[PDB]
Paper text:
We expressed and purified the dROS1 ECR (construct 1–6) and obtained a 3.94 Å structure using single-particle CryoEM. Surprisingly, model building only resolves the N-terminal region (equivalent to construct 1-4) starting from the N-terminus to the fourth FNIII domain. The C-terminal domains starting from the fifth FNIII domain to the sixth, including the intervening YWTD-C, were not observed in the map. The lack of density for the C-terminal domains is consistent with this region demonstrating greater flexible with respect to the N-terminal domains. Interestingly, the model reveals that rather than having a linear arrangement of domains, the N-terminal region adopts a folded-over conformation stabilized by an interaction of an N-terminal cysteine-rich region with the second propeller (YWTD-B) and fourth FNIII domain. The domain is comprised of two disulfide stapled helical hairpins that associate with one another through hydrophobic interactions. The two helical hairpins generate two loops (capping loops 1 and 2) which stabilize the N-terminal ECR compacted fold. In the loop generated by the first helical hairpin, capping loop 1, F235 sits between R1234 and L1236 of the fourth FNIII domain. F231 sits between R1032 and L1034 of the second propeller. Our structure, of dROS1’s N-terminal ECR—being compact rather than linear, suggests that the bulky ECR could physically keep the kinase domain at distance and prevent oligomerization and signaling in the absence of ligand binding.
Drosophila ROS1 (dROS1), also known as Sevenless, is a critical RTK required for R7 photoreceptor development. Like all other RTKs, the architecture of dROS1 is composed of an extracellular region (ECR), a single-pass transmembrane domain (TM), and an intracellular kinase domain (KD). Here we show, the extracellular region of dROS1 adopts a folded-over conformation stabilized by an N-terminal domain comprised of two disulfide stapled helical hairpins.
Residue numbers in the entry: 215 to 357, 377 to 755, 764 to 1289
Write the structure that this text describes.
C-alpha cells in the first residue's frame, strides 16, 4: 500500500536531486546504477528489513554499488515514517479508547504487590513485546512537573511492577507514553489512569508554607500558615517555636491539625522576633520554616498625667470636655433638653457630630478658643432611601473617606429592620450599605485605615466592610460592653462590666484571652479610653487613670466631674487615633527591564494583610533612586504613581543598579527594597522580529516599543525565518512545513514554488551561498541553491537542528540525544556533549564563531539547563549556566544568539515572554513581554543592522579540466588516476568525489588528494568512465566526465 507512494515519490523526485557523482537519468531510462533503481530496491527491502527491524543504512548495503546507497536509505526511512503514520491512524480508529486501570489493590495476605495494571489486549505482533516505551506519572496539583519512571518490569501481560521511589502520601496519575514518530507534537497518549494515592509512612518533607506573619499590636504577634505541598502522612498538629533575637525567652506552642492561624501573647515590644513553623505527623517531625517580623513599637506612658491630649466626657445631656493634664480644664461645651444618643469625632476639622434620640444632627464645630458654636440642624435626605420615617440611632465619622456612617431605624410594624447609610459631610449623598437586620444598634465605630466598620448589638459584634460585601461574626455573648478599636494596633478592647472580663478579641475572631479588669477603688463602667498600655477608666463622679498591670487599680490622677455624675462614654482626643495612613509596607517583587537608553521598571504594590478589607485605604506615593556602581551618580525621582514606570535618558558609561521605596501620603521615608542588577550600553539600535501564531510578523525595538508592522502575512505558527539575501527568506512552521516568501517583490518566483513537508529547521551559509534544512523524512540534510534549485545530500544522520560555521566549513548538527560537529574528515568529528535517554533531549543550539564557542539547550525532566563548550577543546568546560525554576519549556530552535547584547535569546512555550541570559551576568534572567499585537509569539530573531555579506565566489573550486584527467605511470593493477588539482581562488583544501564505471560495476572514492590509487582492478586496459566532482569543505564544483584506458 505504501510501495506505490515510494514509486510515485521516486518518479516525482528522480530529477529533483542532482547527485554529486554526475549520475543523470532521463525519462524512460533503464540504467540500473541510478536513483530510481536504488529507491525501488529500498522500498522493496523496507518491509523485509522491518521483519527483524534492522537499520536502513545496514539494510541498504550493496555488493556492487559501494559505499552508501543514500537514495535507498531515504526510501527506507520515509517508508518507515509512512508506515508508522498508517499504524497511528489504524490504532486510533480501531480502539485507543481504553485506559490502564487498577481494580485489585495490594492485599494484607503477606503480598506486598505495588501498582498493578490490568489493561485490555488489542495489539498486533512486533509492536506488542519487542517494542519498548516509557511511562510517565502526572502530579495532581490544583493550583506540577511531570516525570517518567525509570524502573518497571512488564511484558505482554502489561502488568508493570515499579521499584521507582514514589514518595508516600501524594496523589498520582499514571499513563502510557507510546512513542510514534520523532516530532514532539506528533505523539499519541493513553488518556488517563484513575487517580491513585500511594500509601503513607514517611516524615514530612516540605516545611509549612507561611503566607502572612503580621506584627499585630505591640505584643501579640500573629502568624498565618497552611499544609505544605507535601504531607507524608496524616497531619495531627504543628510545632510553633518563637525565639527572641536578643534573649533566651523561647515559647513553644502546639496546635491541632485543623487551624489556619495562631497568635502569641505577652511579648516584648519593639524587638525583632523569629518564628519556627514545623509540620509534624504521627511518626515524627518535619522541616522548619523561618519568618522574620518585629512587633509594633508601643507608645510608652509618657509624662504620667501631664499629656496635653484631652478626652470627651459624655453624660445623659452633656458633651463635657476635659484634658488629662494636672488641674486640667473642665470646660463644658453644649447642653440639650433631650436625651443624647452618641457623638462622632473629626480630627481634620475641629467639628463634632451630635445626635439625640430623635435623630437631630447638630453641627458642633469646636471654635478655636471658644466653646459656643452654632447648633444648626443637618436634616438628612430620604428620597433615595425610602418614603417611610427614618430616625437614626447610632452614628460615627470616617476621617479618610470623608463621610458619615449611620445606623437607621425602619418604620416597619413588629419587624422593624435597621440599616446603614453612608452620607456626605452635609448629609446628602445617601448610599445603601449592607443588609437589614432586626437587632437594635448600640454603638457604631468605623476603622478608616484598614477599612472596617464595627458595631455591637445586644447579642453579637458583627463586622462589615466599608461597602457591605463581607459580613463576618466576631463574638457572641450576653450584653457586651464598650469597645475602642484603634487603627494602628489591629486589636479591639471589648469591655464587659457584668462579667468583669475586658476581653482583647482580635480582628479575625480568634485570639480572645481576657484580662484582669481592675476592681473599683472604693460600681460599673460603660466605656473607657486607651492611653497606650494604660487604661483610662471613667468611673461615676471620679476619673481614674490606672496603669493596667492587673492588681494595680490605683488612681494615678483624678479629675472631679461634679458637674456631671453620670458619665457613660469617653473618647480620647489624640491626633494619633485618626491617622492619615499606616505602616509603610515596602514594595515587593522589583523587576527591571532595560533597553538602549530607556528602561521599563515594574514593581508590585505592597501586599495587603487579611485584617484589612478590599476598600482599605492604600494611597501610596512612590520614589525611586538610581545610582551607578562605578560612577556613583545617584538621583531620586519622586511624585510617581502606579506600579509601572519608564526610565528615560540613561547616561552612557554607567550601570544602573536600582531600588525603589514607597512614600506614605504624609511624606515619611518608607522602607528600602532589595537592590537589583542592570545592564550597560550594548551598541545602539536593534531590530527584533516577532512571529505571531496567527502568522503576523511584527518588528519592534529592544523593549518592544516603536512598533513597525509588516504589510505581508505568513502562514500559521511560523518559526525563525532566515534571510538568503535582503529580499527572499526561508522559514519553518510549527507542523514541519517550510515556505519560501519574498518580502519586497512577491511576484518574483521563489527557487522552489511548492512548499516542502516534514522539515525541522533551516539555515543559510553566507560564504557558500547554500541553504540547509533538516529533513525528518530522510533523517538527513540536503543542499539547496536559491538560483539553480538543485539538491545534494550530505551524509549527516538524525540531524534535527543545524548551524554552519562558515570560517572552516565544519558542519554542526544537533541530534535528539547527542551533539557533534561534522567536518571533512572522520577524525575531526568530536562529540561536544551527549545525553542519555532519561535526562531529556536537546531543545535548541546556536553557534558563536567570533568567540569560538558553542551553546545549546538541554530539555530536562522539569527544567532547562544552559551549557557552553569550546570548539578547540573537546568537552572541556561543560557548565550548568541556568537551571530555570518551574516548568517553562522553550520553543525548539527558538534559541538565537544576540551579538549586539552578547546574550542568548529563546522564547518560552506560552509565547508571551522571552528570557535573556547574558554572558557577563548569567545568574539574572531578564523578562521580555511579547507585544499584544503579536501575542502569542512563535519565533523571535534579532536582525543584524549590518547587511548580510554577499556570496563569495573566491571558493567554488574550478571544474577539473577534462584534458588534465590522466592515469600516471603505474602497473595496471596499481596506478594513480591523476588530474590537475582543482584550484579554489581562496586556496581552500579541495576534496574530490570520484565515480568509476567499468562494465556493470561501479567504484566510488572520496579523496582529499588530486590522485586516486586504484588497486585490485580485475583486468588491464579496461575502459574506465571517470566522473570527478571537485568539492571544497563548503561547496561542490562542476563534474567532469572523462574516459581513459590504463597505461603502463
Amino acid at each position: 500500500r505504501v510501495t506505490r507512494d515510494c514509486v510515485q515519490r521516486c518518479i516525482v523526485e528522480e530529477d529533483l536531486f542532482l547527485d554529486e557523482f554526475g549520475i543523470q537519468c532521463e525519462k524512460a531510462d533503464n540504467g540500473e546504477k541510478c536513483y530510481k533503481t536504488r529507491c525501488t530496491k529500498g522500498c522493496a527491502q523496507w518491509y523485509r528489513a522491518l521483519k527483524e527491524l534492522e537499520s536502513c543504512q545496514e539494510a541498504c548495503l550493496s555488493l556492487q554499488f559501494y559505499p552508501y546507497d543514500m537514495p535507498c536509505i531515504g526510501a527506507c526511512e520515509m517508508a518507515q515514517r509512512d508506515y508508522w503514520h498508517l499504524q497511528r491512524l489504524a490504532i486510533s480508529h480501531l480502539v485507543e479508547r481504553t485506559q490502564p486501570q487498577l481494580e485489585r489493590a495490594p492485599r494484607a495476605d503477606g503480598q506486598s504487590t505495588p501498582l498493578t495494571i490490568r489493561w485490555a489486549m488489542h495489539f498486533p505482533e512486533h509492536y506488542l513485546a519487542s517494542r519498548p516505551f516509557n511511562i510517565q506519572y502526572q502530579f495532581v496539583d490544583h493550583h506540577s512537573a511531570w516525570f517518567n519512571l525509570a524502573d518497571y518490569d512488564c511484558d505482554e501481560y502489561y502488568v508493570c511492577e515499579i521499584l521507582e521511589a514514589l514518595i508516600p502520601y501524594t496523589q498520582y496519575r499514571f499513563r502510557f507514553e507510546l512513542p510514534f514518530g520523532e516530532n514532539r507534537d506528533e505523539v499519541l497518549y493513553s488518556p488517563a489512569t484513575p487517580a491513585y494515592q500511594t500509601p503513607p509512612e514517611g516524615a514530612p518533607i516540605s516545611a509549612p508554607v507561611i503566607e502572612h506573619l503580621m506584627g499585630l499590636d505591640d505584643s501579640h504577634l500573629a502568624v498565618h500558615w497552611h499544609p505544605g505541598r507535601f504531607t507524608n502522612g496524616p497531619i495531627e498538629g504543628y510545632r510553633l517555636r518563637l525565639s527572641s533575637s536578643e534573649g533566651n525567652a523561647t515559647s513553644e506552642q502546639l496546635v491541632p491539625a485543623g487551624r489556619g492561624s495562631y497568635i502569641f501573647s505577652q511579648l516584648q515590644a519593639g524587638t525583632n522576633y523569629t518564628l519556627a513553623l514545623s509540620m509534624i505527623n504521627k511518626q515524627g517531625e518535619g522541616p522548619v520554616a523561618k519568618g522574620f517580623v518585629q512587633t509594633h513599637s508601643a507608645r510608652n506612658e509618657k509624662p504620667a498625667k501631664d499629656l496635653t491630649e484631652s478626652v470627651l466626657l459624655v453624660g445623659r445631656r452633656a458633651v463635657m470636655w476635659q484634658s488629662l493634664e494636672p488641674a486640667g480644664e473642665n470646660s463644658m461645651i453644649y447642653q440639650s433638653q433631650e436625651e443624647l444618643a452618641d457623638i462622632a469625632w473629626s480630627k481634620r476639622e475641629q467639628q463634632l457630630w451630635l445626635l439625640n434620640v430623635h435623630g437631630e444632627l447638630r453641627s458642633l464645630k469646636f471654635e478655636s478658643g471658644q466653646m459656643v458654636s452654632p447648633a444648626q440642624q443637618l436634616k438628612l435626605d430620604l428620597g433615595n432611601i425610602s418614603s417611610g420615617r427614618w430616625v437614626p440611632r447610632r452614628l460615627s465619622f470616617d476621617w479618610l473617606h470623608h463621610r458619615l456612617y449611620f445606623a437607621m431605624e425602619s418604620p416597619e410594624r413588629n419587624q422593624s429592620s435597621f440599616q446603614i447609610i453612608s452620607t456626605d459631610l452635609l448629609g446628602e449623598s445617601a448610599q445603601k450599605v449592607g443588609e437589614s437586620f432586626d437587632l437594635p444598634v448600640e454603638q457604631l465605630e468605623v476603622d478608616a485605615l484598614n477599612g472596617w466598620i464595627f458595631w455591637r448589638n445586644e447579642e453579637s459584634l458583627w463586622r462589615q466592610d466599608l461597602h457591605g460585601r463581607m459580613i463576618h461574626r466576631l463574638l457572641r455573648i450576653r450584653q457586651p460592653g464598650w469597645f475602642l478599636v484603634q487603627p494602628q494596633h489591629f486589636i479591639i478592647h471589648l469591655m464587659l462590666p457584668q462579667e468583669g472580663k475586658f476581653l482583647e478579641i482580635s480582628y479575625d475572631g480568634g485570639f480572645k484571652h481576657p484580662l484582669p479588669l481592675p476592681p473599683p477603688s472604693n460600681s460599673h463602667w460603660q466605656s473607657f479610653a486607651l492611653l497606650g498600655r494604660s487604661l483610662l477608666l471613667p468611673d461615676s463622679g471620679q476619673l481614674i487613670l490606672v496603669e493596667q498591670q492587673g492588681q494595680a487599680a490605683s488612681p494615678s490622677a483624678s479629675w472631679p466631674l461634679k458637674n456631671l455624675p453620670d458619665c457613660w462614654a469617653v473618647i480620647l482626643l489624640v491626633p494619633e487615633s485618626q491617622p492619615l495612613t499606616s505602616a509603610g509596607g515596602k514594595p515587593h517583587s522589583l523587576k527591571a527591564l532595560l533597553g538602549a537608553q530607556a528602561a521599563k521598571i515594574s514593581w508590585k504594590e505592597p501586599e495587603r494583610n487579611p485584617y484589612q478589607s478590599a476598600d482599605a485605604a492604600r494611597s501610596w506615593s512612590y520614589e525611586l533612586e538610581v545610582l551607578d556602581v562605578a560612577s556613583q551618580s545617584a538621583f531620586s525621582i519622586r511624585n510617581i504613581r502606579g506600579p509601572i514606570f519608564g526610565l528615560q535618558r540613561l547616561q552612557p558609561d554607567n550601570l544602573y543598579q536600582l531600588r525603589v521605596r514607597a512614600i506614605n501620603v504624609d511624606g515619611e521615608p518608607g522602607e528600602w527594597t532589595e537592590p537589583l542588577a542592570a545592564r550597560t550600553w550594548p551598541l545602539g539600535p536593534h531590530r527584533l522580529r516577532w512571529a505571531s501564531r496567527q502568522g503576523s510578523v511584527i518588528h519592534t525595538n529592544e523593549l518592544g516599543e516603536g512598533l513597525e508592522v509588516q504589510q505581508e502575512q505568513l502562514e500559521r505558527l511560523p518559526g525563525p525565518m532566515t534571510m538568503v539575501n535582503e529580499s527572499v527568506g526561508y522559514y519553518v512552521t510549527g507542523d514541519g512545513l517550510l515556505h519560501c516568501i519574498n518580502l519586497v517583490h512577491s511576484q518574483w518566483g521563489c527557487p522552489i514554488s511548492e512548499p516542502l513537508q516534514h522539515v525541522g529547521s533551516v539555515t543559510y551559509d553566507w560564504r557558500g551561498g547554500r541553504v540547509y534544512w533538516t529533513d525528518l523524512a530522510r533523517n538527513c540534510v540536503v543542499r539547496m541553491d536559491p538560483w539553480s534549485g538543485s539538491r545534494e545530500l550530505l551524509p549527516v544522520f538524525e540531524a534535527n537542528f543545524l548551524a554552519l560555521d562558515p570560517r572552516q566549513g565544519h558542519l554542526y548538527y544537533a541530534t535528539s540525544s547527542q551533539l557533534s560537529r561534522h567536518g571533512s574528515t572522520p577524525d575531526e568529528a568530536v562529540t561536544y556533549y551527549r545525553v542519555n535517554g532519561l535526562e531529556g533531549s536537546i531543545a535548541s543550539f546556536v553557534l558563536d564563531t567570533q568567540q569560538d564557542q558553542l551553546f545549546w539547550l538541554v530539555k530536562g525532566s522539569g527544567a532547562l539547563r544552559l551549557y557552553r563548550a569550546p570548539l578547540t577543546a573537546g568537552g572541556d568546560s561543560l557548565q550548568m549556566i541556568q537551571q530555570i525554576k518551574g516548568v517553562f519549556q522553550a520553543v525548539p530552535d527558538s534559541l538565537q544568539l544576540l551579538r549586539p547584547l552578547g546574550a542568548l535569546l529563546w522564547l518560552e512555550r506560552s509565547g508571551r515572554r522571552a528570557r535573556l541570559v547574558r554572558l557577563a551576568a548569567p545568574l539574572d534572567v531578564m523578562e521580555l513581554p511579547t507585544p499584544d499585537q503579536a501575542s502569542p509569539a512563535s519565533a523571535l530573531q534579532l536582525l543584524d543592522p549590518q547587511p548580510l555579506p554577499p556570496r563569495d565566489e573566491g571558493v567554488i573550486p574550478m571544474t577539473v579540466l577534462p584534458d588534465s584527467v590522466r592515469l600516471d605511470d603505474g602497473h595496471w593493477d596499481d596506478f594513480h588516476v591523476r588530474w590537475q588539482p582543482s584550484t579554489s581562488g581562496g586556496n581552500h583544501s579541495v576534496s574530490y568525489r570520484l565515480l568509476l564505471e567499468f562494465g556493470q560495476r561501479l567504484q566510488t572514492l572520496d579523496l582529499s588528494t588530486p590522485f586516486a590509487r586504484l588497486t585490485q582492478l580485475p583486468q588491464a586496459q579496461l575502459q574506465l568512465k571517470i566522473s570527478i566532482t571537485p568539492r571544497t569543505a563548503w561547496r561542490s564544483g562542476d563534474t567532469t566526465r572523462v574516459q581513459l584506458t590504463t597505461p603502463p
